[PDB]
Amino acid sequence: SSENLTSAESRIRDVDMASEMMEYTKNNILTQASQAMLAQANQQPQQVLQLLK
Amino acid sequence: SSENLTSAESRIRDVDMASEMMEYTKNNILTQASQAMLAQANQQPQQVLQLLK
Amino acid sequence: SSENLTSAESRIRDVDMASEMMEYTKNNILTQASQAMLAQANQQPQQVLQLLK
Amino acid sequence: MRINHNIAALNTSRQLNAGSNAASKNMEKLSSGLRINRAGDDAAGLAISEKMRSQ
Amino acid sequence: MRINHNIAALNTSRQLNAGSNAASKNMEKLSSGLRINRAGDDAAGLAISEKMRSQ
Amino acid sequence: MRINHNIAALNTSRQLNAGSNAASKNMEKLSSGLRINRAGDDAAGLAISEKMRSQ
Amino acid sequence: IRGLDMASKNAQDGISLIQTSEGALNETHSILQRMSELATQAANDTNTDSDRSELQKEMDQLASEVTRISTDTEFNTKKLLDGTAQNLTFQIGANEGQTMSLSINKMDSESLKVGTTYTANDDGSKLVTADGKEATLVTKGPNGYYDDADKLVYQADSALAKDTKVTKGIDISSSAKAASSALTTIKTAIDTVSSERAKLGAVQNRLEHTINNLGT
Amino acid sequence: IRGLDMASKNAQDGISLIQTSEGALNETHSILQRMSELATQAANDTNTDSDRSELQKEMDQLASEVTRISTDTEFNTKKLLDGTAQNLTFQIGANEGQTMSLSINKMDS
């Protein structure tokens, strides 16, 4: 009854290493995609200076 | 009648060590094959960052 | 009465080699999992430099 | 290239948690030495065995 | 071209502080090895677990 | 993105210095062969053992 | 999607609830198996009543352990084998009516008929079983809770506390004929335990297929 | 152009609807495969009726899962394997009549 409950509690509490590392990598890329586009988002307002002169 | 029934019950209940160790090794490899390809599966989405810049 | 008490004291005091080696290996992996993720945790703040320039 | 979901890795995860389960089931038999540990391995095998052991 | 506000960059900032939070939450699970660290990850999971551990 | 503090790494450090401690405690038992090395592992176990050894 | 991945947790939390029950009945089989050797030995007539009643000591101790497993086996805070875990509905599916029921029968010595459980009345004068078989205290001879036929039921000189249950094994010590009679009763109990175990092994096999299909 | 690029979404939303159905029948195969071992074992005459009826417990539980897959397999809000997904028309093309039909039969026990 300890094995059957230890296994029962592990499924509820312990994390799946495979299903979590794969999900961590996804959000670790989605933040770099937003990081990359944030840099370009700041460059866009810089083009009105050539028009203002 | 005990030998004839002990042998009869062993065939029904006891496991074949040879036929089971050989099967255990197979699934013990199929999980490493999936383990190896899971690592590469996470690397594939990482290549869009070089395109996003 | 010495055997019955020696066995009684061993259960209270002596460790189970199997149940302890298996537990030692678990924490010996959980520390490497935290070791592996600590390295990546330090890399994450390094990405703001490409945005700051 | 869709980033929010990695179906290639999500599919590989299921196959990962399907050979591990089979290996765990195989190691139960190897350690105990019995084909039928739970009643789900053989219902009639479990029933016949207990009659046999009793006899 | 409106200069006093960069809605394109302001919108990207929120998505930046929404995948970083998710990655931080994912790394908590990976380091600890537990799905339920806080009680907000699973209320019933937290309740069942503690009963289970106690047992 | 806050730089002056890395809560993700600071949280991982605590889990790093919590499995190392457990592994160290487990290796004490494995080397000595005794469950109860210190009195904090089992107070009643320590008390009963010494009575037992004496006897 | 967030329903099927959560209904896959329910399917696996039902696999654990079912493994616990059949894991418990795994031992009711061994106790019933040992309990059957102490009726082929008690049926031999080289034994005397001093030795049949000697075997009855383990008879009552095995039958009292079969009852313990039923009332003690507990997943979460649910008693599985005491007959209260009925109509257990697992939501294996993301919608209404995508459930599976389950009913585990009472699997104690009283239900298998390999024993009987007396409970102590409020004063403790008479041990009372369900269906109401009396066992009065200090009734003189050796001291204990005697029955209406002078057959000692429990060996105690004081009075038992309130709602203290005692389990008494099936009769194998009164005669060799009685011990033989208990042989079919025990071997039938092994049959109604094997039926329960594979009623739970069948559900677990189904839930293993439900998990692969929910994951796919 | 805006039709072919949208009709390419319909073609891929039909690929998903079809992968779901055959993904479900992937398991009706395994249940039917296990269901066939519990008839070569039940046909042996060393079994007794106490044990054939013992196998029937899993017989009825496997056959009740084959029915579940049919009535539960659902893409979008469409039951695919219950015999109601008939004449499914995918507009693979930017014009009239550039469609493909499909009819999945009822696949329950």
Numbering used by the authors:
A (entry chain W), B (entry chain A), C (entry chain B): 275 to 327
D (entry chain A), E (entry chain W), F (entry chain B): 1 to 55
G (entry chain L): 56 to 194, 198 to 274
H (entry chain Q): 56 to 164
Question: How does the study describe this entry?
Answer:
In this study, we extracted extracellular fibrils from lab-cultured Bacillus amyloiquefaciens, a Gram-positive bacterium with great potential in biotechnological applications such as plant growth promotion, biocontrol, and commercial enzyme production. In this study, we use cryo-EM to identify protein fibrils surrounding lab-cultured Bacillus amyloiquefaciens and discover an unreported fibril species in addition to the flagellar fibrils. In summary, our study identified two protein fibrils outside Bacillus bacteria: the extensively studied flagella and the previously undiscovered Vpr fibrils.
